[PDB]
């Protein structure tokens, strides 16, 4: 079951961010038409400083759609009365 491989979905993004967007971290991109958020993993990054402006270029790999509100709906498990 490990050897199967499915369809690959990717994104190539250029925009403004901070120095925290580097290879090996997860990022979130919002879809404009449906207002849905998806989770991506960063595969390649590049930061440039020139002429007083700073831009980033990322190569993103799609993981899954972020669940509206909470997927498993984790609630803080507390007793009704503390004492």
């Amino acid at each position: 079951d490990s050897e199967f491989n499915g369809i690959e979905k990717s994104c190539s993004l250029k925009g403004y961010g901070d120095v925290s967007c580097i290879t090996g971290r997860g990022v979130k991109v919002k879809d404009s038409y449906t207002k849905l958020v998806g989770l991506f993993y960063i595969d390649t990054d590049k930061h440039t400083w020139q002429n007083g402006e700073y831009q980033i270029e990322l190569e993103l790999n799609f993981q899954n759609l972020m669940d509206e509100k909470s997927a498993g709906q984790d609630e803080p498990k507390e007793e009704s009365n503390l004492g």
Binding site: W49, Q50, N51, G52
Partner: protein
């Protein structure tokens, strides 16, 4: 003032002195932009001078001509055209100024436009510099 174009001992003097003459010179400047300070520039070298002449070759002995004994208009045209064709290195001088240098001909245009059979022309010249190859 007089105007001469000479190729070794072969010399030609213009029969009608032009209404004006101008010399153009430029220098190259290299620009860079450094973060948070702005633009900077450095000297990069000087370019070659250029000069353009407009006048006519007369078909008769006028009162305002520089001298007497000049050739026919098309003789002058043929001589200058041959010089431009072979790419000769010539010497161009205007007396009573600081203009005395070696040049090469870039363009030559001539025309007739009235009932006098005079030939109007325009001549473009460019400064010439020889390259020095070092040896040991």
């Amino acid at each position: 003032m007089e105007m001469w174009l000479r190729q070794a001992e072969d010399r030609f003097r213009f029969p009608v002195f032009p209404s004006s003459f101008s010399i153009n010179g430029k220098a190259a400047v290299n620009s860079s932009s450094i973060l948070k300070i702005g633009e900077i520039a450095t000297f990069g070298g000087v370019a070659l001078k250029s000069i353009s002449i407009s006048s006519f070759f007369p078909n008769k002995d006028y009162t305002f001509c520089d001298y007497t004994g000049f050739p026919s208009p098309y003789d002058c045209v043929n001589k200058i055209e041959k010089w431009m064709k072979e790419g000769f290195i010539l010497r161009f001088t205007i007396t009573e100024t600081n203009i005395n240098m070696e040049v090469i001909i870039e363009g030559f245009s001539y025309e007739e436009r009235d009932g006098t059979r005079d030939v109007y022309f325009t001549l473009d010249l460019k400064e010439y510099k020889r390259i020095k190859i070092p040896k040991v």
